[PDB]
Each structure stands twice: as structure tokens, then as C-alpha cells.
Design a binder for this molecule. Structure first.
Ligand SMILES: *[C@@H]1O[C@H](CO)[C@@H](O)[C@H](O)[C@H]1NC(C)=O
Lengths: 103, 262, 15
């Protein structure tokens, strides 16, 4: 809560297509409205680091805060859990955000 | 459809961990097309869009030398700013620069932008006239005076009206298959027992500009979906059995007739 | 195509 010099990331986790078990898709973690820009983003499958995640679309808004997309190809199943885990100076602990399949 | 080119340049200090990290990302509309990162092994500009395979080795060498010079301009101006603000070495600090041009659907220049921020708030910005500056604090008032005397604005105005527009025209033509396409939204509504939440989704659309209305409203900023298309949702909380009175509307460049759904 | 190397520094020391 040094809200004058840091901004806490907003973490959005969503698929390209409405999910269908065993149909190929893309999982996105859009990490937004943060400052300062150093950040670490992992995408997790059943609690473990997905390799070969692409980081793209780094930009900043009119209020100067930072945006970045992490994305990966995946095929959802009934029993695979997906999350985005973020570490940023604004937060004591890494934050893990779980994909909401039914939003 | 009007179009824009924009660059997002950031240096961020990391005291005791090494020199500041310098990143420059270029966009045509909302498509990233080039990127430099000082932390890469072999830092250079790299293409992020397929139309940039048309440019030759001379193009990559010249813009990579610009990034090597620009990196040092950000590192020295970070160190200047510590002395302007009487800040200690050792704290994390950030210098941002956004610049670019907007053109109409006929390609003519609509406006240009040069804006700087220190530690995530306004520093100095060029006005719409491309001639005079807005300084946001006491430090930037001194820069404004020096930059008025040196004629800084004239160098930026020459870029924004010439090079920026001429390269944006070249990229719109070379990337016309990607950049001038229209992918119309695919929309659906989801039903969430809560009150009840109605959520109108737009998926699979290009370009990013859209309007979602319910006929108050939760939403998210339009967001990239990982394959160069965009998505958006807007939600309302409605009375627990009378939700057929509610209608989601979507407007987009690819819908000559807007969608209506419930 | 990016902007060329910035010609001027901030110089915000004052007197
Ligand atoms: C600047 O910072 C130093 C060291 O932190 C401090 O002792 C000094 O009083 C400051 N000078 C001004 C003008 O605030």
C-alpha cells in the first residue's frame, strides 16, 4: 500500500475459444495496469510451469501503467487445472489466479 | 478505418543488478511489429509481424544502431533525473516515451504524439500543434525552457509529419492482408446464478475497436486473444427471472448490421 | 521505423 509509487497488476486468464474438452485452444494471461515494469509471469498446468509460453503485446496506457500478454496453445480436459502466477514488487507473495472455464 | 503507428520505449533502473533495461516496442494499430530488448543475448530489433520480412538487412542494421544510441540517451537521462529530484542511487526508477502518428482512412495525417513520463507520471509532452510543450512539474519546466531554446520540437515534428507517416503507409500496404482485414465478432451470452449476472461475450474480432451495450455495467478493456484477434465482455446483474427483457448489442467494422442477442 | 536518437537531454538541474 505505497499506492503513489506502485500499481498492483490486474490478472485476466481466458481462452481464445469457449473451452471444449480435448479441442485445441489458446490460454491467455493478460497482466495489466502495473508499475514499475519489472514483472515475472508463469503459466501453470496442474501447479507446474508450462514451457515455451510466449510473452507479447508489451505496452503502456494513457495513465503510463504497463500491460503484457502471456499465451500458450493448450487442449483443455475435464481434470487439468490452469493458472497464471505473477510476482511484482507491489505484492509480498506471488499471486496465483485460476482460469474460470465457465465465465 | 483510420490507422496509427506508435512506439513504446521504456528504461527501468535496477540498482546493483546491472545497467537499466531498455525496451522499445512498435505497433501498427494494435499489432506489435518490432521489438528491441537490451536484456536479449545479442540485442537487436526483431520482427513480430509477417510483413516485416519484406525489409532488408540495411533496415535492421540502421534501426538497431538507433536502439543502441537511444539506450544510452535513456540511461544518461535516468541518471540526470536522480540529480534533478535529489533521489538516491539504489531506488528503482522508470523513464517512458510514447510517440507516433494517426492517419485517416485516406492516409492523410490526423495528429502526432510525443510524450515522456518519469516514475509513471507525466513529465513533458508536445502539444497537438507539434510546436509547444506542456511541462507537468518543476523539473519539466526547466527542460521545456532548454528544449524551446534548442528547437527540439522542430526535430520531432519533422519525424511525425514525414518519416512516421511514410513508414506507416509502407507497413499498411506490405501488411494489407493482416492490417486491412475485418473479422466480425462471434457473440454469446452466459447466465450466472448470483440476483443473476448476464455476460455478453464478443470473440474472434479484428480490428480491436468495438462497442458492447446492454439495453450499471461491468466490463474489461478489449484484450488480445493470442492469435491476433481480440475479445471483450460486458455484464449486467438482472432480476432473478425477467432476463428476456435484456438485449446485448455489438457494433464493429465487420457488422454492416450490429448484432442483437439475449 | 522508430524515432532517431533523442537530440537533447533533460537538463533539469536549474540554478
Ligand atoms: C538531498 O538528499 C540528501 C541526501 O539524502 C539530503 O541530506 C539533502 O538535504 C537533500 N537536499 C535537498 C535540497 O533536499
Amino acid at each position: 500500500g505505497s499506492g503513489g509509487i506502485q500499481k498492483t497488476p490486474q490478472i485476466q486468464v481466458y481462452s481464445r475459444h469457449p473451452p471444449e474438452n480435448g479441442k485445441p485452444n489458446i490460454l491467455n494471461c493478460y497482466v495489466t495496469q502495473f508499475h514499475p515494469p519489472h514483472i515475472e509471469i508463469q503459466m501453470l498446468k496442474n501447479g507446474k510451469k508450462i514451457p515455451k509460453v510466449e510473452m507479447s503485446d508489451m505496452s503502456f496506457s494513457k495513465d503510463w501503467s504497463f500491460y503484457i500478454l502471456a499465451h500458450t496453445e493448450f487442449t483443455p480436459t475435464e481434470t487439468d487445472t490452469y493458472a497464471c502466477r505473477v510476482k511484482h514488487a507491489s505484492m509480498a507473495e506471488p499471486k496465483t489466479v485460476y482460469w474460470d472455464r465457465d465465465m | 478505418g483510420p490507422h496509427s503507428m506508435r512506439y513504446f520505449e521504456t528504461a527501468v533502473s535496477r540498482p546493483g543488478l546491472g545497467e537499466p533495461r531498455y525496451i522499445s516496442v512498435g505497433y501498427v494499430d494494435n499489432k506489435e511489429f518490432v521489438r528491441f530488448d537490451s536484456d536479449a543475448e545479442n540485442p537487436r530489433y526483431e520482427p513480430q509481424a509477417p510483413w516485416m520480412e519484406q525489409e532488408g538487412p540495411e533496415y535492421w542494421e540502421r534501426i538497431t544502431q538507433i536502439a543502441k544510441g537511444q539506450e544510452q540517451w535513456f540511461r544518461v537521462n535516468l541518471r540526470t533525473l536522480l540529480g534533478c529530484y535529489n533521489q538516491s542511487a539504489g531506488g528503482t526508477h522508470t523513464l517512458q516515451w510514447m510517440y507516433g502518428c494517426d492517419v485517416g482512412s485516406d492516409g492523410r495525417l490526423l495528429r502526432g504524439y510525443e510524450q515522456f513520463a518519469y516514475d509513471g507520471s507525466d513529465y513533458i509532452a508536445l502539444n497537438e500543434d507539434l510546436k509547444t510543450w506542456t511541462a507537468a512539474d518543476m523539473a519539466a519546466q526547466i527542460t521545456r525552457r532548454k528544449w524551446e531554446q534548442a528547437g527540439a520540437a522542430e526535430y520531432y515534428r519533422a519525424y511525425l509529419e514525414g518519416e512516421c507517416v511514410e513508414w506507416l503507409h509502407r507497413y499498411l500496404k506490405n501488411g494489407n492482408a493482416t492490417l486491412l482485414r475485418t473479422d466480425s465478432p462471434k457473440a454469446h451470452v452466459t447466465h450466472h446464478p448470483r440476483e443473476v449476472t448476464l455476460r455478453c461475450w464478443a470473440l474472434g474480432f479484428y480490428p480491436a475497436d468495438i462497442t458492447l451495450t446492454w439495453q450499471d455495467m461491468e466490463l474489461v478493456e478489449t484484450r488480445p486473444a493470442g492469435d491476433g484477434t481480440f475479445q471483450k465482455w460486458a455484464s449486467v446483474v438482472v432480476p432473478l427471472g425477467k432476463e428476456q427483457n435484456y438485449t446485448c448489442r455489438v457494433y464493429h467494422e465487420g457488422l454492416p448490421e450490429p448484432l442483437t442477442l439475449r | 521505423h522508430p524515432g532517431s536518437v533523442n537530440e537533447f537531454d533533460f537538463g533539469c538541474g536549474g540554478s
